[PDB]
Design a protein around this ligand. Structure first.
Ligand SMILES: CC(=O)N[C@H]1[C@@H]2OC[C@@H](O2)[C@@H](O)[C@@H]1O[C@H](C)C(=O)N[C@@H](C)C(N)=O
Ligand SMILES: CC(=O)N[C@@H]1[C@@H](O)[C@H](O)[C@@H](CO)O[C@H]1O
Length: 335
C-alpha cells in the first residue's frame, strides 16, 4: 500500500499576502497557488505578489487561467488574446496557434508566474456552455493539430502545458447546479471522438486536468476521482506520464458528499498529484489538515511544471515578439 504523495494548490483573497496567507503558504504539503481577477491590479503588482510569495516558498508553483477569449485573468497591461475558436478560423491557423501559445506564455511568465492552465482540448459540439469558443474545433484531429501547435508555442517560451478537461467536456452539459453533468456514451464512442486530442498529445503535454463529469458507461465517479479513468485509461492506454491536477475540489455545484478532507484524499487515491481548493479558505485548511495527517510528500514530477522563463520587463525586445504581434495583427486576432 502506498504511503501516498500529494500536494495542495490554494488561493488568497486579495492583491497582497495577509499574515494568514503567509503562514498557510509555509506548509510543505502546500505546493501551489492559483491567482484570479480579485488578486490582479496591474502588472507591476502581480510581479510583486509573485516575488512576495517566492520570498516565502521559492519552490511554489504559481498558476493562472490565461487561455484567451472569454477566459483571460491577466487583462490590463496585457495583450488581449483570441478565443481558441477564432484562431481556427484562418487559413494559417497552425502558425497563429503557435504564435498565440508563445505570446500568452511569455507574458504570463514576465509577471512571475510559472504556468497557465492551457490549452483546452475539449471539442465544440455546440452542447456544453462551459466549452463553446474555448475549444479550437469540433473535428477531433484538427483540434489536436491546432492544440499541439499551441503547446509548441508555450514550450518555446519555457512554459509547461496543462491540457483539459480530460477525458473531454464537450458532450456533457455545463455543470448545472442540479446534478453533476453526465456524458452517457459508450467508452468506444468517447475513444472515437473526445478522447482523440488527449490521445494525440499525451506524449507532449506536461500535465492534465480532469472534467467534473460522470461517464456512467465507464465509471460511476467523476473522472477526477476514478482510478479507471486516470490509471487504466490515461496512464495505461494513453501512456500519459505527466502531472495530474484535480478539478476544483471546492467548486460551487460540486455535488460530492464529504468535506474537502475526504475529497482531496479521494482525488489523491485516484491518481491525482495535486488537489485544487479554490475560493474557499476554510476548506483549504481542512484539506491541508488532511494532507498533514497522511504525512504526504510531494510528487516527484511536480517540479517539471515550474516555468523556465523569468520575471522581466524585457521580452518585447526579443525578436520573436514582433513577429507574433505582426502575424496576429494581420489575422485580426489581436490589437
Ligand atoms: C474566478 C471565476 O470567475 N470563475 C472560476 C471559478 O474558480 C474556479 C472555478 O470557478 C472555475 O471553473 C472558473 O474559472 C473558469 C475558467 C471560468 O471562469 N469559466 C467561465 C468563463 C465559463 N463558465 O465559461
Ligand atoms: C470546465 C472549467 O472551466 N474548469 C475550470 C478550469 O478550466 C480551470 O483551469 C480551473 C481553475 O480555475 O477551474 C475549473 O473549474
Amino acid at each position: 500500500g502506498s504511503h501516498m504523495q500529494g500536494s495542495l494548490m490554494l488561493d488568497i483573497g486579495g492583491t497582497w499576502l495577509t499574515a494568514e496567507d503567509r503562514q498557510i503558504l509555509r506548509h510543505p504539503e502546500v505546493g501551489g497557488l492559483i491567482i484570479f481577477a480579485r488578486n490582479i491590479e496591474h502588472p507591476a503588482q502581480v510581479r510583486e505578489l509573485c516575488a512576495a510569495i517566492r520570498a516565502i516558498r521559492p519552490d511554489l508553483l504559481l498558476a493562472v487561467d490565461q487561455e484567451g477569449g472569454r477566459v483571460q485573468r491577466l487583462r490590463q497591461g496585457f495583450v488581449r488574446l483570441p478565443a481558441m475558436r477564432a484562431i481556427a478560423d484562418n487559413p494559417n491557423a497552425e502558425e497563429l496557434a503557435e504564435h498565440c501559445g508563445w505570446l500568452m506564455a511569455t507574458e504570463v511568465q514576465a509577471v512571475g508566474l510559472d504556468l497557465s492552465f492551457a490549452p483546452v482540448l475539449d471539442l465544440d459540439h455546440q452542447r456544453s456552455a462551459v466549452v463553446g469558443s474555448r475549444a479550437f474545433e469540433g473535428d477531433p484531429e484538427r483540434a489536436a493539430l491546432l492544440a499541439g501547435a499551441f503547446i509548441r508555442g508555450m514550450h518555446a517560451a519555457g512554459m509547461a502545458a496543462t491540457g483539459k478537461h480530460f477525458p473531454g467536456h464537450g458532450w456533457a452539459e455545463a455543470d448545472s447546479h442540479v446534478a453533476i453533468p453526465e456524458d452517457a456514451r459508450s467508452l468506444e464512442e468517447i475513444r472515437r471522438s473526445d478522447l482523440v486530442p488527449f490521445a494525440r498529445l499525451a506524449g507532449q503535454l506536461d500535465a492534465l486536468m480532469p472534467a467534473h463529469v460522470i461517464y456512467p458507461q465507464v465509471d460511476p465517479q467523476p473522472a477526477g476521482f476514478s482510478r479507471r479513468w486516470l490509471q487504466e485509461i490515461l496512464r495505461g492506454e494513453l501512456k500519459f506520464d505527466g502531472v495530474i491536477f484535480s478539478d476544483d475540489l471546492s467548486m460551487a455545484g460540486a455535488h460530492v458528499v464529504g468535506d474537502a478532507a475526504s475529497r482531496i484524499e479521494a482525488a489523491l487515491a485516484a491518481g491525482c498529484d495535486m488537489g485544487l481548493v479554490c475560493n474557499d479558505r476554510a476548506s483549504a485548511e481542512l484539506a491541508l489538515a488532511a494532507l498533514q495527517r497522511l504525512k504526504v510528500t510531494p510528487p516527484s514530477r511536480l517540479q517539471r511544471m515550474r516555468g523556465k522563463g523569468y520575471a522581466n520587463t524585457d521580452y518585447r525586445q526579443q525578436p520573436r515578439w514582433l513577429e507574433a504581434l505582426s502575424a496576429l495583427r494581420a489575422a485580426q486576432l489581436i490589437d
